[PDB]
Amino acid sequence: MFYGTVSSPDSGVYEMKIGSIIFQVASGDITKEEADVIVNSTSNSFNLKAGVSKAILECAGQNVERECSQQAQQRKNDYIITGGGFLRCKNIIHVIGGNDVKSSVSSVLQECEKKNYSSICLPAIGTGNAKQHPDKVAEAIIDAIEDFVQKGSAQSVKKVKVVIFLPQVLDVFYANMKKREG
């Protein structure tokens, strides 16, 4: 009921429509991306600096690092929202890599609608040190978007890009997209 056709606008990039949203997966370094929100995949303390969280915090800068620690105090947070620092985004949403990926992506999508944001970039949450299986992660990310669209919640959000660090993970996402295509 929602899926378009998988196509490729550049080598190593694949996209398909999911309702009104363009869902893209691409190879690369997320810190090179521009989007309204960039998603960080971190630990329960929000001060992880290994893997994608290291790339993100080192590029975002020390003010963002301070923001994370401060917010982590305030509450028993499931995710936190900070400024983008020196990343090319309006906000970073920091989710926990070990947490349910579908829930995490749903939260991200909701927060983006709240801010009338149109673009999101995220990594393959949980597929590194968290050791969540890439196919389960892919399934969860795409499921979250499909559910969002089904519920009629997608109004401002128009583009969701997963930036993926290795071929092995890219191929899994592509397979999961291809399985769903109309």
Of 166 and 175, nearer to ligand AR6 (C-beta) is 166
The reply, when asked if residue 165 is annotated as ligand binding, is: yes
Q: Is 76 buried (19+), middle (13-18) or exposed (0-12) by CB count in 10 A? A: exposed
Of 149 and 163, nearer to ligand AR6 (C-beta) is 163
Smallest distance from ligand AR6 to CB 151, Å: 26
Smallest distance from ligand AR6 to CB 134, Å: 7
What is the rounded distance in angstroms from the CA atom of residue 91 to the CA atom of residue 76?
A: 20
Tell me if 51 contacts ligand AR6 by CB under 6 A. yes
Only segment of 27-35, 66-74, 81-89, 149-157 that touches ligand AR6 (CB under 6 A): 27-35
Using CB under 6 A, which of 38, 55, 60, 144 touches ligand AR6?
55
Order of strands across the sheet that contains 91-96: 7-10, 13-18, 21-27, 159-164, 119-122, 37-42, 91-96, 79-83
Cα separations (Å) of 160 from 24, 34, 65, 106, 130?
6, 12, 25, 12, 22
Smallest distance from ligand AR6 to CB 152, Å: 30
Provide the pairing of β-strand 119-122 with 79-83: unpaired
Site for ligand AR6 in 76-135 (CB under 6 A): 96-98, 123-130
15-41 in b/e burial notation, b at 16+ Cβ within 10 A? Answer: bbbbbebbbbbbbeebbebebbbbbbb
What is the rounded distance in angstroms from the CA atom of residue 162 to the CA atom of residue 181?
A: 17
Only segment of 4-12, 18-26, 44-52, 112-120 that touches ligand AR6 (CB under 6 A): 44-52
Binding-site residues for a glycoprotein:
29-30, 41, 52, 126-130, 165
Q: Which stretches of the chain bind ligand AR6, using CB under 6 A? A: 29-31, 41-43, 48, 51-53, 55, 96-98, 123-130, 163, 165-166, 169
**Annotated binding-site members:** 29-30, 41, 52, 126-130, 165
